[PDB]
């Protein structure tokens, strides 16, 4: 089998993306953030604290046939950015873009942190990291492309993120129209339960390529590029006016700049990121500094591969036995 959605940007500057995602019979359609550094499928719900409800669209399990309470599980999250959910567990029928998987875990959310009930354009998070990140308890659940692998013509998925547009999430096939050149696929560690990999090095606009190992995360549902002090600052150096502000949480530029190209190496391959990727706009309406798109890792503990670079590849998520993560330009 295979599964083809559309996901699409919840806003002008690509904070997210969201994904249609049917639940239950008959179905329920919620538009989710489907997240590679996470591993719970949870929805804003009927049993969801109503204060902490704001224009989100529900799953109600008492509607669907097929819906059954998973006895005595519950699920609590919390996430790198300081957010949080917690609910309990159904198992129901769940598809995205004609991919089907019976007895899914749908985490239902009882509670959810201000940031989320803020966000009024997702319905919830599909994890695709590995299932040992799973939160469920007492008895751990498998994430939907775990429970789908099995079944698919081939045991991957790809994301394809657009700028400032719609892309693509496959299951089951790369789609071979969807790249160019070939894909550069290169080993992963599982060890922390994320797809964990390391890039060969990294070049700010026309320069010269610096290769040096970075370790670090493919993770969709991380909006920006997060990278070492060293790597972050030597591209900011080259935008005149930019400077990391600490009140404001990062490097933050003029917006009048345009903002140089930042490459990442995989292999001997090489990404690049059009300065344009890189900037995420006013800090607040109205302002002319603008917030960087890349931002330094230093005390959040990991390198994040967010949208940001991702978007600018076309990327393979292969959970073969030994899994890897390909690459290719767009």
């Keep these: 089998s295979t599964g083809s959605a559309t996901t699409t940007p919840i806003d002008s500057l690509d904070d997210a993306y969201i ?65 949080s959910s917690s609910g309990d567990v159904y198992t129901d029928t769940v598809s995205v873009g004609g991919l089907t998987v019976t007895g899914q875990a749908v985490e239902s959310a009882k509670k959810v942190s201000s940031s989320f009930t803020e966000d009024s354009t997702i319905d919830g998070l599909l994890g695709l990291a590995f299932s040992t990140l799973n939160t469920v308890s007492p008895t751990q659940q498998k994430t939907f492309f775990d429970n789908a692998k099995a079944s698919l013509d081939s045991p991957v998925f790809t994301a394809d993120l657009g700028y400032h547009a719609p892309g693509t999430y496959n299951f089951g096939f790369i789609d071979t129209t969807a790249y160019t050149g070939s894909i550069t696929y290169t080993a992963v560690s599982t060890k922390q339960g994320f797809w964990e990999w390391t890039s060969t090095g990294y070049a700010v606009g026309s320069g010269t390529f610096k290769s040096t190992s970075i370790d670090g995360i493919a993770d969709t549902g991380t909006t920006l590029l997060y990278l070492p002090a060293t790597v972050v600052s030597a591209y900011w150096a080259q935008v005149s006016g930019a400077k990391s502000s600490s009140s404001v949480g990062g490097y933050v530029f003029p917006c009048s700049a345009t903002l140089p190209s930042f490459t990442f190496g995989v292999g001997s391959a090489r990404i690049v990121i059009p300065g344009d990727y890189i900037d995420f706009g006013p800090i607040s309406t109205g302002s002319s500094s603008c917030f ?36 290719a330009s767009k």
């Design 19 to 83: 994904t249609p995602v049917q639940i239950g019979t008959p179905a329920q359609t919620l538009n989710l953030d489907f997240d590679t550094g996470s591993s719970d499928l949870w929805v804003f719900s009927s049993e969801t604290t109503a204060s902490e409800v704001d224009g989100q669209t529900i799953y109600t399990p008492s509607k669907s046939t097929t819906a059954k309470l998973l006895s005595g599980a519950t699920w609590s999250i919390s996430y790198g950015d300081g957010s």
């Design 292 to 327: 960087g798109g890349i931002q330094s890792s230093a005390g959040i503990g990991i390198n994040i591969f967010g949208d940001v670079a991702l978007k600018a590849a076309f990327v393979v998520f292969n959970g073969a036995t030994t899994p890897t993560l390909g690459f």
